[PDB]
Amino acid sequence: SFGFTDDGVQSSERFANQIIRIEAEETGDNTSTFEGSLEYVMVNQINIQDAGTFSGITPIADDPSFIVIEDLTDEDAPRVNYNDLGADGVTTPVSDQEEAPSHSGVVSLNADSYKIADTVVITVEDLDLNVDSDLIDIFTVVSDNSKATDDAVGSATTQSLSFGELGRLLDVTFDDVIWSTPDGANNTATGNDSDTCSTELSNAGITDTGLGATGFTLVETGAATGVFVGDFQIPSFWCRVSDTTTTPYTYAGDEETTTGLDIEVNYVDFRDASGEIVEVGDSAGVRAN
């Protein structure tokens, strides 16, 4: 069994019940040494909602894997037990344990000031986001007008909880407002003139209408590096979100220049150094000449 109850904020509210068997292999012909491996996947806000991550582990193998719901140290550190028949003839087990810490994530922006049509590069240093050592780990932006996690890096599957929205891992904002494309049912405002904000952007030749339309993705630099990098290009115009409390969002009726507005990136760590939810961010200024 795997999951959490209520918010899942308190430790007593998170659970993971599993048994793992190691089928170790003899190194040589007459070498009494038997070799095996372990690996674990630390749970994040995205994979916790998918039954795929829990069914993905291999419980019985020479190289098993197991799930970690939170930081496991001291008495709770994962331990492997081996029952043994000793040279004195009595059965005495032998065991080893290793701690499985969680890591505090940082997010950064490569420059302190950007200009229009400058490449902006986002990096996230969270070791806990590496879930496979063989494959590059990738996170993608959500495009679903019926969910609260729209135009953000995360999952369309989502829930409303105390700490915020469970399907949201990263997003980008101009002037502390989500940078989203004017689409859906609440984009009918025309503003001063009779032109809606969506066609208003199109007449300016802008295709980077929001974060979801630049093709921005977080890509791990190596197979097991734990560092994720994405990039996109600053647009000349953008369409402000009037009200964020409705789904879909309600968009303004007039486009606005990005010049003189700050740009920010927000990352939500499902597991910090203690195994608790925290949000971290970075900022920079868009300039003009």
Partner: protein, 144 residues
């Protein structure tokens, strides 16, 4: 861009990552000045045009699957986009007996070059019984 696939042999998977590459173009003059009647190299480096690692590839105008071609322009040529995005239709039929395509000739005479254009169309057994209509697009610099 950024999405991937996964191929596995010998219980070791490998990602197949999709990405784009920045290009670099540079004219390389052989000596200090480029004078009349001298060939100098032009070199382009773009990994996005290397679509086969086991073959050498040419930037042919005529191939639609080569997406970009270098171009040089001077003064005001009259390219096919001079009036904006064109409109093109293909057709089956036969030239009229008065058509310039059947009566004209290239002999520097108004009698040969100048005429009118008449045709008879039979697209009745064509798909949806209409002349083949097209979606048009124009390259920014190559004008194709």
């Amino acid at each position: 861009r950024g999405t991937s696939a996964s191929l596995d042999y010998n219980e070791t998977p490998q990602t197949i990552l999709v990405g784009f590459s920045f290009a670099s173009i540079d004219i390389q003059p052989v000596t200090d000045e480029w004078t009349s009647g001298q060939e100098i190299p032009v070199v382009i480096v773009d990994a996005d045009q290397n679509k086969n690692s086991r073959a050498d590839e040419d930037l042919d105008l005529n191939n639609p699957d080569v997406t970009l071609i270098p171009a040089l322009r001077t003064g005001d040529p009259f390219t096919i986009d001079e009036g904006g995005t064109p409109s093109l239709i293909f057709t089956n039929g036969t030239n009229g007996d008065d058509s310039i395509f059947d009566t004209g000739a290239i002999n520097n005479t108004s009698a040969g070059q100048v005429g009118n254009f008449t045709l008879n169309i039979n697209v009745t057994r064509f798909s949806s019984a209409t002349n083949i209509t097209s979606t048009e697009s124009i390259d920014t610099f190559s004008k194709r």
